Amino acid sequence: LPITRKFYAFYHAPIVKFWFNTLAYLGFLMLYTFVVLVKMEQLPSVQEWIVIAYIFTYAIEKVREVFMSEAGKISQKIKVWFSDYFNVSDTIAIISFFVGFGLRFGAKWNYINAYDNHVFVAGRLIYCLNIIFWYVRLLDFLAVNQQAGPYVMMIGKMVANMFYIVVI
Amino acid sequence: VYLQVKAISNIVWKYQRYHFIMAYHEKPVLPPPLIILSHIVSLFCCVCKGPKLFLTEEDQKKLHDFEEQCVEMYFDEKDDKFNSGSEERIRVTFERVEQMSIQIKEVGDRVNYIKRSLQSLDS
Amino acid sequence: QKSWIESTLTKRECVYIIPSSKDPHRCLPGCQICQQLVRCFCGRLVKQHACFTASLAMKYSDVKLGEHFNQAIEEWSVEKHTEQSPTDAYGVINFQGGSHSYRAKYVRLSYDTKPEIILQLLLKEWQMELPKLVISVHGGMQKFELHPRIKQLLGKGLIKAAVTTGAWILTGGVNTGVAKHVGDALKEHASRSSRKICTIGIAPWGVIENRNDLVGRDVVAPYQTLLNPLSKLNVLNNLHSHFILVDDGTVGKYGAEVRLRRELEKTINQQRIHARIGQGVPVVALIFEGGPNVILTVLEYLQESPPVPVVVCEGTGRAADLLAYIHKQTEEGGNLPDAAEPDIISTIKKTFNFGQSEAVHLFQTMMECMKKKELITVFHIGSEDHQDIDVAILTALLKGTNASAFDQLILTLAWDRVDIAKNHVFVYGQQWLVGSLEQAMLDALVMDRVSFVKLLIENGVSMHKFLTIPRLEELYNTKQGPTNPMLFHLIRDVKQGNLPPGYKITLIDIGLVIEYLMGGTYRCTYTRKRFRLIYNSLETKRFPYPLNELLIWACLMKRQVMARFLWQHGEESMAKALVACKIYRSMAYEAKQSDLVDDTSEELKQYSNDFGQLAVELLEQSFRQDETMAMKLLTYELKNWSNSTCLKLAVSSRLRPFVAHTCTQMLLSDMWMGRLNMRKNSWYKVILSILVPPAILMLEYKTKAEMSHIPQSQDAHQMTMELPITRKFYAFYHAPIVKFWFNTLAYLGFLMLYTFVVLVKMEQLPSVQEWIVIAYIFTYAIEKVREVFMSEAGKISQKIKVWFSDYFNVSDTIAIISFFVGFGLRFGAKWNYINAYDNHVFVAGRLIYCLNIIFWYVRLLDFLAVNQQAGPYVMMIGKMVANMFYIVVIMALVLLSFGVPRKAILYPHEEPSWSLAKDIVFHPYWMIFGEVYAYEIDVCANDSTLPTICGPGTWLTPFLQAVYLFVQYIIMVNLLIAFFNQVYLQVKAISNIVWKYQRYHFIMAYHEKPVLPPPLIILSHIVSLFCCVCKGPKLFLTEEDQKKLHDFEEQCVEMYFDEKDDKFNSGSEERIRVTFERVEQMSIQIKEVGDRVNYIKRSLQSLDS
Ligand SMILES: CCCCCCCC/C=C/CCCCCCCC(=O)O[C@@H](COC(=O)CCCCCCCCCCCCCCC)COP(=O)([O-])OCC[N+](C)(C)C
Ligand SMILES: CCCCCCCC/C=C/CCCCCCCC(=O)O[C@@H](COC(=O)CCCCCCCCCCCCCCC)COP(=O)([O-])OCC[N+](C)(C)C
Ligand SMILES: CCCCCCCC/C=C/CCCCCCCC(=O)O[C@@H](COC(=O)CCCCCCCCCCCCCCC)COP(=O)([O-])OCC[N+](C)(C)C
Ligand SMILES: CCCCCCCC/C=C/CCCCCCCC(=O)O[C@@H](COC(=O)CCCCCCCCCCCCCCC)COP(=O)([O-])OCC[N+](C)(C)C
Ligand SMILES: CCCCCCCC/C=C/CCCCCCCC(=O)O[C@@H](COC(=O)CCCCCCCCCCCCCCC)COP(=O)([O-])OCC[N+](C)(C)C
Ligand SMILES: CCCCCCCC/C=C/CCCCCCCC(=O)O[C@@H](COC(=O)CCCCCCCCCCCCCCC)COP(=O)([O-])OCC[N+](C)(C)C
Ligand SMILES: CCCCCCCC/C=C\CCCCCCCC(=O)O[C@@H](COC(=O)CCCCCCCCCCCCCCC)COP(=O)([O-])OCC[N+](C)(C)C
Ligand SMILES: CCCCCCCC/C=C\CCCCCCCC(=O)O[C@@H](COC(=O)CCCCCCCCCCCCCCC)COP(=O)([O-])OCC[N+](C)(C)C
Ligand SMILES: CCCCCCCC/C=C\CCCCCCCC(=O)O[C@@H](COC(=O)CCCCCCCCCCCCCCC)COP(=O)([O-])OCC[N+](C)(C)C
Ligand SMILES: CCCCCCCC/C=C\CCCCCCCC(=O)O[C@@H](COC(=O)CCCCCCCCCCCCCCC)COP(=O)([O-])OCC[N+](C)(C)C
Ligand SMILES: N#Cc1ccc(COC[C@H]2O[C@@H](n3c(NCc4ccc(Cl)c(Cl)c4)nc4c(N)ncnc43)[C@H](O)[C@@H]2O)cc1
Ligand SMILES: N#Cc1ccc(COC[C@H]2O[C@@H](n3c(NCc4ccc(Cl)c(Cl)c4)nc4c(N)ncnc43)[C@H](O)[C@@H]2O)cc1
Ligand SMILES: C[C@@H]1CC[C@@]2(OC1)O[C@H]1C[C@H]3[C@@H]4CC=C5C[C@@H](OCCC(CO)CO)CC[C@]5(C)[C@H]4CC[C@]3(C)[C@H]1[C@@H]2C
Secondary structure, three states, X not given: OOHHHHHHHHHOOHHHHHHOOHHHHHHHHHHHHHHHHOXXXXXXXXXXXXXXXXXXXXXXXXXXXXXXXXXXXXXHHHHHOOOOXXXXXXXXXXXXXXXXXXXXXXXXXXXXXXXXXXXXXXXHHHHHHHHHHHHOOHHHHHOOOOOHHHHHHHHHHHHHHHHHHHHO | OOHHHHHHHHHHHHHHXXXXXXXXXXXXXXXXXXXXXXXXXXXXXXXXXXXXXXXXHHHHHHHHHHHHHHHHHHHHHHHHHHHOOHHHHHHHHHHHHHHHHHHHHHHHHHHHHHHHHHOOOOO | OOOHHHXXXXXXXXXXXXXXXXXXXXXXXXXXXXXXXXXXXXXXXXXXXXXXXXXXXXXXXXXXXXXOOOOOOOOOOOOOOEEEEEOOEEEEEOOEOOOOOOOOOEOOOOOOOOHHHHHHHHHOOOOOOOOOOEEXXXXXXXXXXXXXXXXXXXXXXXXXXXXXXXXXXXXXOEOOOHHHHHHHHHHHHOOXXXXXXXXXXXXXXXXXXXXXXXXXXXXXXXXXXXXXXXXXXXXXXXXXXXXXXXXXXXXXXXXXXXXXXXXXXXXXXXXXOOOOOOXXXXXXXXXXXXXXXXXXXXXXXXXXXXXXXXXXXOOOOHHHHHHHHHHHHOOOOOOOOHHHOOHHHHHHHHHHOOOOHHHHHHHHHHHHHHHOOOOEEEEOOOOOOOOOOHHHHHHHHHHOOOOOHHHHHHHHHHOOOHHHHHHHOOOOOOOOOOOHHHHHHHHHHHOOOHHHHHHHHHHOOOOOOOOOHHHHHHHXXXXXXXXXXXXXXXXXXXXXXXXXXXXXXXXHHHHHHHHHHOOOOOOOHHHOHHHHHHHOOOOOOOOOOOHXXXXXXXXXXXXXXXXXXXXHOOOOHHHHHHHHHHHHHHHHHHHHHOOOOOOOHHHHHHHHHHHHHHHHHHHHHHHXXXXXXXXXXXOOOOOXXXXXXXXXXXXXXXXXXXXXXXXXXXXXXXXXXXXXOOXXXXXXXXXXXXXXXXXXXXXXXXXXXXXXXXXXXXXXXXXXXXXXXXXXXXXHHOOHHHHHHOOHHHHHHHHHHHHHHHHOOOOOOOOHHHHHHHHHHHHHHHHHHHHHHOOOOOOHHHHHHHOOOOHHHHXXXXXXXXXXXXXXHHHOOOOOOOOOOOOHHHHHHHXXXXXXXXXXXXXXXXXXXXXXXXXXXXXXXXXXXXXXXXXXXXXXXXXXXXXXXXXXXXXXXXXXXXXXXXXOOOHHHHOOOOOOOOOOOOOOOOOOOOOOXXXXXXXXXXXXXXXHHHHHHHHOHHHHHHHHHHXXXXXXXXXXXXXXXXXXXXXXXXXXXXXXXXXXXXXXXXXXXXXXXOOOOEOOOOHHHHHHHHHHHHHHHHHHHHHHHHHHHOOHHHHHHHHHHHHHHHHHHHXXXXXXXXXXXXXXXXXXX
């Protein structure tokens, strides 16, 4: 196979698109985690800008995933993509981070001590909680394996079929 | 409830593996920090400029032949898996042996007439 | 042109015109209605002959104006008045409406076509293989009628003979004749849809119905099932596959059967039946009620050269009956009994409705038909006369056609059918040629016909006699069978890349493959200096044990069904099966690695575990007879398999169920004992007798009789050839159980000192204890080196690959290397002379000790697993740690899902630090173990240990943690419990087997270990070193005992088969099968009596009256 057709066949492989997103997402969770733990000044650090960039561009990937879906009438496109645990959890996590970035960038910043503007405080605690949507998503990646998938697909069927013991 | 959720959860997994693979098979190459490039390319050009199993007409026939034979076997095997089973051979055996009893005893009668005959014909 | 059919074949058709019967019927002016109706002698309506040149004559009436010598026309020359052109009717019938739509196919050619063309397209274009029989059914073709038994039974044969020989039944095609009748059989049987009989049934395009439906080039046809009551044109019969529709160039006419159905028959009989075989493909002629023409056609095949035989049938109709009728009257053929020589002509009259001049003419044909009664037969369904027309058909080609039993057999070989030859070739008083039996075994082996191998080896063909170098050597060099295309791969590997053009495989080569497949040091006979000589020189050119040499062939070339057959024969049955399990297991590994197409590996892995399961099932059949001899079987030097052992082969194939049998464990115990009888003695006494040497003299040992089944070294054999006091010590100390309890009590005296050093302070120089500690490890390390260099394996790269495939030999390497980093930095240091633990070098070297210790307590599981109860539980902790890696990663997301928000919400001023890598992982890990940090939740509360962490957002952590533990203590930690509880039997069952297997490698390591433990072992090293520079076990039998053991194996094999045959024949499922099949047959033989008895009654009601 020639050199030019020997790249195109790699990059347009599903396994490659996976291990080329995982290593990005696992480089997103290592920066976001860094932002969440480390203090946060008036303006986003280089890391936090890259964090917003992923989510934003990721959100666009989730819109185009809807409009260019197989389904027909939009009301049916908006009924298969929301019948998915992680596409809801993205919606909740993309909408929430932009409540967080809204109240974090959009704030008065007392200039004496942060965490004296409850607006600023709020927008962070949105970040520090939205994070749970993004570690839990690694089960979308970890379930690729023939051994791990099932154990991920059991934690739904054990949480569901024990609601009644847990009320007792 | 472990076996009966582990058996299912394999099947729900192997089913969801379809919707997952066939989403990367239409996903951009480039990940969601740099995907915006592949979006602008597709956007810019779609305003300006799924998979298929491409067979040759010869292979459409060879595959068509494959389906035909494989159907024919499915029936020819199950018919034998039924006729070869013991429960079925007991049924036939039973129903024969019923019929056999009949066609023997009527001979048993008839033979008893050919005997009392020859005991008296020539005498 | 794109189509080889019409590119080659052509269609003939009338091009001139010849008015057939000029005289018009009615409608006073002839001119129009004459031409409109009066057909050409061409065939169809004269007006229909388009073919433009004729149509510029049809314009007025015809060619050759009106009268214009009306007599002159009257021939329709089928070359001048009839030109041909490329075919435009060749396609595929679909038989519109057919109940699963059975298919066929058609062409349309000119009868002058030569058979080379019909044959080549048949086998190229239509893509078939040459058959192995041609049943050309030249019978009567008048839609005739039969009785059910002969409608039904006669097919049971005819189908069967043709599916068992891949035949091509060659009918007349049409559904109003012999074609119609075979279809009645073809459907009643259905051939269990497959590539069954590939019936041809050649007929014309002239008498055919719906010719216009299937016109066009390579075109599907809507050919329809027209059972219109009159329909002068006829349908092709249903079940017939491939058709030919030879267009003479005329509707209505006949003749497009014989011009080709002659040539085809001869032309197939001209071709070779198979690559190996060199006969002509057989032709057999079947007759269903024939006719005036057929009864001559019958005669023609009798008169052909080759004399193609015929098969007729009593009770299909006129001809088959009469040919069977005169077969009764005529005796010898030459006779005709003259008392009835027109009395048959009385019958010849009534059956047909013949006349007189033809009556003798039929009778004439009957004579030459009988003149050779030799090559013709009859089917008497009414009696037991060679039942099931198969045998008659298959047989008839052998009885009549003069051919040697070789030439007979070799045909039956091609037809994969012994039952014929078993009862019609291998019959009484036969002229069996000297080498024909041999030359046939050459063919049955290569072609994979085990059934004829069995047949020939029964009738007498010694493998010892039929197994030279040249014979055997080419059996590899054949493609004429189910070849493994992988054998050529392993060869080109061991040649290191070399690959000549044709490459005659030599027996040097097969040896080097087996040396490579069996591994270790397995030297085949094919590579030894002796055999290398004689191979470069060519009964001394024979092999002693052939079925040991073919069993390799049958397995290298992946011919399982041959391998098992060649296994039950011969001798050394257990050994052979375990070699096969290694070869297949070894080919599978090379297939996976070196792929080219479909792995065939699971095909081989199934082939290994089949043999490898016979050995296990052959052993138990020997362990249940005499457990003693069945332990000698596992140990006697084989001498045909590289001086190896029936057990060292199982271990080589990782065949756990054999080493984990209860005979391979009672032997290993008997070696674990040694010369000790530890069923009387007790483990108390050994531990005493070690620390009390003179208590050895009160231990009850075993006699040389009780150590017959126990393989020994040379020296112990000598101490039993040449008990005294001096031989009563040597037998103790050189016991494996003693070498164990004499190392444990050292190692357990090492761990009690090392532990003392680790805990107690450590001054500048090692204390007496720590010197003894170093001594053990050092001398122990030497024991681990010599354990490698003097290992069984060959090339060092393989010695350095088995000793590192062991959990504790790695852990030693890590622990011996590490302690000498520790002793290096502990002895090699400056020692501040004010306080230790102020030299980080010294500190370091200790913490190496205090951590290396974990390698040395964990090793007591190598000692504790000796027990039959503890071993498994030790061999489970591997299979539970392995098969839960994936729950435990899910348990680490949840940990950081919680640890990152909490350290973010509670400590919101943290500069970058390494503490942000502990405190996101630290407390959330100790929560899994029930430490809730209850006075650190709700840090703003009044009972808090963290009243300074109170700030914005810190009310969220009680919720996160609630969610956390519900996952990490109720969902997930109780998912483990449910994991283990449900994977317990299936790991406990295994872990027993993995333990009982590893007990081999453990015992047989003390059986080559020094007596003296790793503090004092250095003495036994220097002794062996000093002397080896200056100066495994064997089961020593006497020649008499080699025979008694040989007898033991023989009988035990014979029972294994004789028992399983009865366990199958005694089972209910099998008795139902027979009962069923009998009771079917019984129904038949009763009801026929029920008939017959009903005739003997109506008789006697009227005879005397
Ligand atoms: C695929 C489908 C699923 C995904 C859905 C995707 C859509 C996501 C849905 C989003 C809807 C959620 C609400 C909007 C977010 C802001 C809300 C907010 O509080 O704003 C604040 C900031 O408002 C500003 O104007 C300043 C900061 C810039 C706004 C950036 C947010 C919009 C980005 C959206 C990009 C989305 C596009 C993504 C690409 C498609 C207003 O409050 P404040 O000014 O801070 O208050 C000052 C108070 N003080 C003066 C007393 C201190
Ligand atoms: C910084 C962070 C701040 C926020 C933190 C707080 C986060 C709170 C945590 C939230 C937990 C989120 C996980 C649950 C996801 C849904 C599960 C699912 O898919 O169920 C089912 C969806 O069934 C349907 O019928 C589809 C529509 C229902 C969607 C449910 C929306 C829940 C919204 C909650 C709003 C929460 C928002 C709260 C916050 C304002 C599964 O599929 P199905 O049943 O087969 O689908 C029907 C298909 N069918 C008809 C063909 C069969
Ligand atoms: C006091 C505390 C109380 C407990 C608190 C809450 C804890 C519990 C969680 C609560 C979250 C709310 C979602 C509940 C799930 C609903 C759906 C379900 O049950 O199963 C359904 C799918 O299930 C899923 O898609 C998700 C299953 C839940 C996973 C929980 C997250 C684990 C990791 C979080 C780590 C966080 C750690 C850090 C936290 C800071 C499947 O059900 P089914 O039977 O197959 O039905 C058919 C489905 N069908 C319609 C699509 C065909
Ligand atoms: C079967 C196969 C598996 C087993 C493998 C068996 C082989 C084992 C493999 C071993 C490889 C591991 C490395 C070698 C060990 C020393 C490393 C080290 O740090 O040395 C140190 C001591 O160096 C000295 O020279 C002083 C002490 C004597 C050296 C004794 C160690 C060698 C013994 C080996 C006997 C092995 C043979 C055993 C018998 C066969 C160097 O550092 P330092 O001088 O302390 O630093 C001073 C710094 N300061 C001045 C600032 C304070
Ligand atoms: C944050 C903490 C996280 C947990 C920490 C880590 C803890 C866990 C341990 C980690 C150690 C790393 C080794 C893991 C084992 C891998 C191999 C395996 O799974 O099984 C394999 C063998 O297994 C063995 O030979 C060893 C099994 C592990 C025993 C663990 C030590 C127990 C005692 C420690 C006491 C320490 C107490 C003191 C501590 C100071 C068998 O697997 P299989 O399926 O049969 O496959 C076929 C094998 N075949 C190829 C040979 C044919
Ligand atoms: C269940 C049966 C039990 C009862 C039910 C009754 C329900 C009624 C509940 C009512 C809640 C509202 C009243 C409280 C607000 C008053 C103000 C206050 O104290 O603020 C405190 C914040 O504390 C909170 O905000 C408390 C938590 C609010 C959410 C409650 C859970 C949602 C319902 C359940 C759903 C969950 C989802 C489950 C997911 C699976 C601040 O005070 P502080 O703490 O001292 O810190 C400040 C210190 N500083 C100023 C120095 C920095
Ligand atoms: C969105 C997807 C992107 C794709 C990812 C790649 C793009 C991301 C690339 C670069 C991003 C950063 C560039 C800007 C400048 C960085 C400065 C900085 O932080 O320096 C710090 C290192 O860096 C960190 O501590 C944070 C970044 C590295 C670790 C986290 C991400 C790694 C994973 C992603 C990559 C591997 C993937 C792994 C998984 C497969 C060092 O400084 P400090 O720690 O402050 O201390 C210094 C000492 N002092 C303070 C005393 C002076
Ligand atoms: C930057 C430099 C490069 C290195 C960076 C990257 C390092 C590596 C990255 C990740 C760690 C795991 C690597 C193992 C992959 C092995 C291959 C494999 O088989 O993958 C499998 C799973 O494929 C997955 O992608 C599984 C999920 C991993 C990504 C998500 C993070 C989960 C780990 C974090 C969780 C928190 C734990 C936190 C712990 C502190 C897919 O194949 P298979 O199942 O074998 O398929 C079977 C059949 N088949 C083989 C025929 C197809
Ligand atoms: C490598 C393998 C070799 C084979 C092993 C045998 C060879 C090893 C032989 C002898 C080694 C010691 C000889 C040197 C001098 C010892 C001095 C000493 O320590 O005295 C102490 C006893 O001893 C101990 O406390 C440590 C040694 C004995 C216990 C640990 C090993 C026992 C196991 C091995 C043997 C049984 C095996 C059991 C399991 C099967 C007593 O002094 P103290 O404790 O300091 O207190 C005194 C009071 N004072 C301080 C107030 C004054
Ligand atoms: C110096 C003065 C003398 C006293 C010192 C010596 C004392 C004794 C030494 C050790 C204690 C155990 C002794 C039991 C032995 C009984 C005999 C036996 O059957 O052994 C078995 C196991 O053989 C072993 O060797 C098991 C492992 C013990 C040595 C390693 C230490 C593990 C225990 C410590 C771990 C740390 C725990 C910490 C706890 C605080 C072997 O035989 P079997 O399984 O019966 O075989 C079944 C079939 N058969 C019978 C037909 C063949
Ligand atoms: N290859 C591959 C592959 C890749 C990813 C996945 C994960 O698939 C996620 C989808 O799987 C769906 N899903 C799931 N998801 C399991 C799950 C999701 C999230 C979490 Cl935190 C957990 Cl504790 C478990 N369970 C389902 C069920 N019981 N019935 C039907 N659908 C289920 C869910 O809607 C979600 O959208 C599965 C397979
Ligand atoms: N008789 C006897 C006898 C004596 C000792 C042993 C101990 O086992 C020794 C070997 O056993 C091997 N082994 C083991 N060892 C188990 C083990 C070893 C160490 C530890 Cl700490 C633990 Cl938690 C468990 N598991 C194996 C497996 N699942 N498959 C194949 N081999 C396995 C391992 O390589 C180790 O070297 C086993 C039997
Ligand atoms: C998939 C998983 C997602 C979460 C996670 O794993 C992978 O992502 C990782 C990224 C890590 C951080 C990267 C860089 C640094 C900088 C360093 O700066 C030293 C400065 C100074 C000290 O004084 C030198 O002198 C401090 C540590 C820190 C913040 C890491 C902490 C652990 C983190 C958060 C890891 C976390 C467990």
